[PDB]
Amino acid sequence: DTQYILPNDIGVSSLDSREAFRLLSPTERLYAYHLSRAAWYGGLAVLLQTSPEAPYIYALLSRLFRAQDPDQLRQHALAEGLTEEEYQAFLVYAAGVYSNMGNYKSFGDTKFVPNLPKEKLERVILGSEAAQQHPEEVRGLWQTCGELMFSLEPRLRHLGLGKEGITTYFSGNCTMEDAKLAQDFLDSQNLSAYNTRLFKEVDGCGKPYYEVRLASVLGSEPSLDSEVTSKLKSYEFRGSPFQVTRGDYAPILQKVVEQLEKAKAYAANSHQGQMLAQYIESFTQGSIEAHKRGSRFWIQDKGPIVESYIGFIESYRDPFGSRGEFEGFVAVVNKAMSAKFERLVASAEQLLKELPWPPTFEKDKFLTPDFTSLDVLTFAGSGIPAGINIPNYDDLRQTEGFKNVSLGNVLAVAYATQREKLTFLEEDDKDLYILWKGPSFDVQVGLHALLGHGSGKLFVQDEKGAFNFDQETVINPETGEQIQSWYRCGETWDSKFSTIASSYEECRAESVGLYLSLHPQVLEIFGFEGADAEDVIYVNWLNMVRAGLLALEFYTPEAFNWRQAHMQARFVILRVLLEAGEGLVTITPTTGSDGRPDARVRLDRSKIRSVGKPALERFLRRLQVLKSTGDVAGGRALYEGYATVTDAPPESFLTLRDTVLLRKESRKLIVQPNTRLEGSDVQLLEYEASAAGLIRSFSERFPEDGPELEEILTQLATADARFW
């Protein structure tokens, strides 16, 4: 319960993937094997996308645990004066770095440090077997990342632009001003920011020069592609010098495409074969257009037995909100659980009409999307989600299609329901909570992805200003006047709304979730029918307003900034429901049984349909309108209004926040399995649900080129050392 540290007794759970793996054919297993290898390899790039010291820390930890496993290192550490508690703190820290691919939390963007004396850890590291075998490599790493491993200077505590934040999407001297200037340049050149970073170097005269570096295997040398290499030049944008380069994470992405090529030899069909070819093209040249073509092929691969997606996909941890963090997952379709979601798709087109906006703001043609339940074998990157809506290419979402994915074996881990852990709830609600926490999620997730992220028309204009809608007929339902604002050529959702783009869209989807959860037909699809159907509704709403309070952990008062998109979104919904008044929801600061400050969330079950629905319907309509028209000014005025955290009566949120932090619970670490090629078969390796078990899972993750990866990450970090 201390900030910027991971507790020793932090929860660790193992991903359950054994049964899903057993059903796979030999060809499918080899397919999943190489894709997993490609994912895990690219996942290392997240280290470079997190903090300057992160690649060094991973290299140091990987060197340490290759020579001595957690039990071998224990005997050395304890012989050096460390207590078992202090050694446990180190194991938890290392598992944290592994599970996040960095020394910052993927959920909250806060730094975490080892919970033990630095000089004690030094004796362990410098006296380790890894140090005895490679004293130069180890002493160099400790000299480099040692201080930053423990430093909790205010400017290092959170991720972000400016001087009071850390980011490696940008050089250290970059600000929001620079990021905005870069995005305008990118938009004008029709160049996606997903696989790019921005570096600003001043000259001898103090004049800044901007480098937009794309991620690719290939560097400045001539290649077969012209779509990217024609962009590899110097520019003049508004007096500012710009240069588009590539070759970011080149040797890492080289490892990735090696495995994508091998996986391509086991593709079940031409859709899988061609999507992998485009991914290879994308990761080799640095073309998002190529990744788009791959994504287009990927959507056409419906109901696969082994589902996968890889690349610089989500843009949450970019403080500007346009650059993508690398991720890659490999999962097995769960035919049984995927049934309830396909029943939702079967009635999805109908349910879209129930949404609080006219079809002029809805997509033209309903494309029947793929919604499946998946059992994860591999999810590389900073963290694991519960459900996904992908691809994030909006031009594909409303013209080609999109896939919906629910990670069933991940949901099971999140169902860790303990009575003691349920904070800010009355005794009457705790029992109802545990009973329907699971079912309500499946319902919420189902609406969040399919009808949430999958709904909404975007107004666009091409190189000649003709619209994908009809300006002469379409009317803004909030003003009554014709459409005034829209998206121009090169503009995306992330490019316009930038810093609030992720939270805004997540809030819109979450609102659709609560809204359409009142629909009895939907309650049938998941099958609750009666009193149970009334119960899952209350719990879903109860969880939301509870989540809105818990969200205060992920807000930074000194920076007036939200750090987590989903939690900020849930705080907004709470503020909206609080705005409706009439005693629908109240927050009451109390005193806990332990004698510490506490709080209680009161939600009147009866006023959910009478007060709650008109509150959301009004709010949800204003969201979609501003989103469809790209009204960033109105969008920010609306969203950042509810997102405001003050100590105003009667809630006093700034006071509540101190209580939220005091009684906060750390998110579980998740251990993932490995796949090996013993002989001609693929075997699944499983690990202990612990810190040591998680460490072991990464010690066996790269058995062929482990030491090589450490050297690669080290040299890639050293190359960019001047930036921070």
Partner: peptide, 4 residues
């Protein structure tokens, strides 16, 4: 667009 995931869901955490």
């Amino acid at each position: 667009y995931p869901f955490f």
